[PDB]
Amino acid sequence: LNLYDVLELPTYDDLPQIKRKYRTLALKYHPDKHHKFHLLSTATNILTNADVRPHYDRWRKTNDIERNKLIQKLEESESSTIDLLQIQRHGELLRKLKHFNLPYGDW
Amino acid sequence: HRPQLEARSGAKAAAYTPTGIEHARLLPGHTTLKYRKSWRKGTAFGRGYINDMTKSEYHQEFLHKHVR
C-alpha cells in the first residue's frame, strides 16, 4: 500500500503542500472524531521537510516497466517476421561408368 | 410522399407502455458469462494488383467463363 493509497489521496509537493495535505486529511479523517493516521504521521514527517519528501518520492514507474517489456516483445516479434544439382549429377555419371564398366578414373 | 427525410426517434418508443409478449429469441440461453484471467522448323511462327472491381484479373476470368 502506498502512502498515497493509505491516505486515499492522489499522487512535487512543497513542504507547505505537505503540511496542507495533513491538515486536509485531519479535517476529513480526524481520529478523535472517527491506525491509518500512523502512516500519515510518518509520511508527513518526511514530507513536512521538503528534502525528505523529495528524496522519499525519488526512491506507476513499474507499470512503465511493463510498457518497456511490451515494447521489447513487439521489437522481437516484428523484425523476426520480416551445388546440390552438381553433386547428384556427378554421382549419376559415376554410376554410368560402373554400368558401362569403363574403368573409373582416380575420381 | 417518398423517401426518409428523417428517422424515427427511439425516444417515442421509450414512453409507451410495455405489452409483455414473450419472444422465442429472448428465451434464456448462454446464461453464464466467461471471465478472462526438322518437323519443328517448317511452321510459320515461334522459332500486378489494380484496385477496382471491373478491371481486376479475377473479374475478366469470371465473365470470360460464365458468359461462354
Place this chain on the structure above:
Amino acid sequence: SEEEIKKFDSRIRGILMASGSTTFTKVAAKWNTSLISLFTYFREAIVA
C-alpha cells in the same frame, strides 16, 4: 460428359421453376423432349 449431364438436370429444373401452373400435359412434353434428346444423341453412353 459431365457438362451435358448438368445441362439435362438444369433443364428439368427449368420445367420445374417455370411450370408453376402450366398444367400437367405441357410439362410432360417438355420432360420427354429433353429425355429423348439426351438419350438419342448419346443413346449408347447413358447406360454407364
Place this chain on the structure above:
Amino acid sequence: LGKVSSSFKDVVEDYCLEKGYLISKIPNRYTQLPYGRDQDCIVPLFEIRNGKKKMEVALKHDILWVEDSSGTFKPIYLWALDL
C-alpha cells in the same frame, strides 16, 4: 537413366572397397533430410570405418550426405570423402 540397371549405393560400395573402409547399415537411427524442396526426407544411415573411426552416411537420390559438426547433413562429392 531409368534404363541403367546399376544402382548408386553400388557405386559407393565400390568406392569404399578401394579405400578399404567398411560400410554398415545401422538399423534404427535415421536423419531428417533437406533436399531442394521445402521439405525434409527421412533416410536410414550407415557408418564407415577405416580402422576404428565411425562416420555416418545417408544417400538419397544420387548423393552422399555427411553431417556437419554442429549437426544436420550436408551433401558432399564422392571424391570429397576421406574420413
Place this chain on the structure above:
Amino acid sequence: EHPYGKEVEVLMETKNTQSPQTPLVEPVTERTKLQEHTIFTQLKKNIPKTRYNRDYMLSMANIPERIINVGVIGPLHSGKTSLMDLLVIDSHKRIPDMSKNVELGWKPLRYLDNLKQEIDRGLSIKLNGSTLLCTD
C-alpha cells in the same frame, strides 16, 4: 510497390493462416485434466489409506530376503486383473473409485486397468502392478 518502394511492406492477404477452428483466445485451464488419456489420482490427500500402515512396509525393503516379486499371467479373461482387484480392495480401506455399484459389485471393479483405451476396449493392455504387504 513504387508508391512506397523502400521501407514499406506491401502485403496482399487472401486465404488464411490459422485454420478457423483455433481458439483465437486460448482457454485458460488452471488444473491439468488427465481424465482423457488415463484415469489416475493426482494429490497426496486422495491416495487411499492402506490399513497396514505403508511406513511399516517401507521398512521391509531393507531386508532383501523378505520382499518378493510375483507376476500374474494367463490367457484372455482368466481373471488376472480382477484377482489383483481382490488383493487391493482387501488391503486399502477406502477407495474413491468404488461406486456403490461395484462395492457390492455386479460390475467388476477393475483397478489395475487404469487406461481409457483399456476401459473402453474391455481388455488389459499395458502391464500395471502394485506393491503391498500382506500377512501369510
Place this chain on the structure above:
Amino acid sequence: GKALNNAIPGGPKFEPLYPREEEEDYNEFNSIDRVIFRVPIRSEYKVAF
C-alpha cells in the same frame, strides 16, 4: 458406423457427418505397384478395428 459412413447389414443408415470425401492426394505411397491385393478388406472389418 455413422462417423465412418458405413452400414452394418441390418443397421441404420445416416448422413455422412463428413460430407467431403472428394479431396484426393496423390503420392507414391499407396501406389498400385507397391501393393499386394490379398483379401478384399470388406466393410465389416472397418467397424471392428
Place this chain on the structure above:
Amino acid sequence: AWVSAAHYNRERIKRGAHVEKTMVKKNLGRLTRLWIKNEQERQRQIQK
C-alpha cells in the same frame, strides 16, 4: 458491393442450391450489364 453480390449469387447457382425464382432473372441481368461493360472497355482500350 453490387458486383460482388453478382459473383456470389452466380457461383451459388452453378452449384444449384435453393436459388429463388427471381434471383436467377436478376442475377442474369447483373451479369449482362457487367459483360457489356467488359466489352466496351476492351474496345476503348483498343482505340487508345
Place this chain on the structure above:
Amino acid sequence: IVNRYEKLLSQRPEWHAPWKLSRVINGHLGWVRCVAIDPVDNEWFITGSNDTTMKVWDLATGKLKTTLAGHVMTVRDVAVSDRHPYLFSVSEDKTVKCWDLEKNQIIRDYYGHLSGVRTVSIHPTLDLIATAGRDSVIKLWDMRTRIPVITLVGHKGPINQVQCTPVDPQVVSSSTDATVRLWDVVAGKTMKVLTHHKRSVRATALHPKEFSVASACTDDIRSWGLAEGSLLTNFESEKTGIINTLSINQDDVLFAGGDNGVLSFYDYKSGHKYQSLATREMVGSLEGERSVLCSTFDKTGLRLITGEADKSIKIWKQDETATKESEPGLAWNPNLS
C-alpha cells in the same frame, strides 16, 4: 484579453517525434470502417469492413489469421473486451452481435434498435454494453441477459460515437445535432451538455490517463475535461474537414484522420499541430477514395493503425531518429482566433 495571448507565448510545448509509414495491408474487398485491438496481448486486430466481414489480422507480421462473417450488411463498429473473452460487433443491420473469442461463433444477439447501430462501447467495470445509432438513443444492454436495461433519451439526431467511463459521466455521446452529452445513467438523464461544436460531432476519444475526452467536428477539434465538464483546450486546425476519427496515444499524442486524406497529428497538452501527412491513394484508386475511416493505437502506443477508404489498412510507425536535429514541426505560432 491580450494577457491570454502573452500567456500563450510562455509555454513552448511538448516536443514529440514525427510518424511515418511502416506497412500496407490490402485484403478487404470493401472499405474498412472500424478497427479495434486486442486489449491484452497486442497480438492482433479486428477490422470491420464494408463487405460485412471482419478479418483478424496479426499485428506483428500483418498476416491474416481468420475471418468472421455473420453480418448481412456493413459493420460500422467493433469492440473487444478486457475482462471477457468477448468481441461485440455491430452493424447497419440493426443488430449487436456478441462473439465468443474461444470458439469463434456468435453467442448472443441483442435486439431492439429501430435502425442501424453505429457505435459500441464496453463499460469497463459493469458488464454492460452501450450501443447507439440512428435511433437517436443510447441503449445500455445487460451483457448477460440481453435486456436493454436503460435507454438514454437526449440527442435530437443520430448518435455517432459513444464512450464509457468508470466514474461519473459513465457515458459520453456525440451526435449530429452538434452536441456532446455527458450522461448520468442511474438517474438516466443528462448530467452536462457541451454545445460548443458548430456541426456534427463525428468522432471522440478518451485520453487513457488524464480523464478527459477529445471531440471533433468539421474544422475544429476541441478537448473536454470530464468531471466538471469544462472545456480544457482547443486544437489549432485550419480547414482539415472532415475529421473522421481521433485516437490518443499514451504519450499524449492526438491523431486526427481526415477525409481529405491528411493525417493531422497533435500534441494533446498544447493544441499544437506538429505534423501533417498525406497518404498515397493506391495503384488504381480514385483521388476521392483517399481518406481515413478509422484508427487506433496499440496498447503501447508506438504504432498506429488506420483503415482507409481505399480498401487498405495502413500501419504508421514513429521515427526513432528524430530528436532536435530535425524534428521540428510547424513550431507554435498562435494565430489570432
Place this chain on the structure above:
RNA sequence: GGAGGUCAACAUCAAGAACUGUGGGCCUUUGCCUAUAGAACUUAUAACGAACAUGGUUCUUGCCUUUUACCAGAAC
C-alpha cells in the same frame, strides 16, 4: 416415542477421478507442505432417467416460386 404420507420448505447432485472439517510448519488471509477425523446420493461399454421429447442461433444439405410448416447431419 415407533410406523408411515402420490405432504411441504430449504440444502445438494458432472468434477485435478474430482468432498469436507480439524491439528501443526513456511510465506504473508490467500497459498504450499505435513498430521488427523468423517465421507449420504450419482458415475467406467461412464451417470441423476436401465427412459427420451421440443425449441433457439450458426453452419452444411434436401424439398424447390416466396414465408410459416419442413428434409437430415454437425457445433454451441
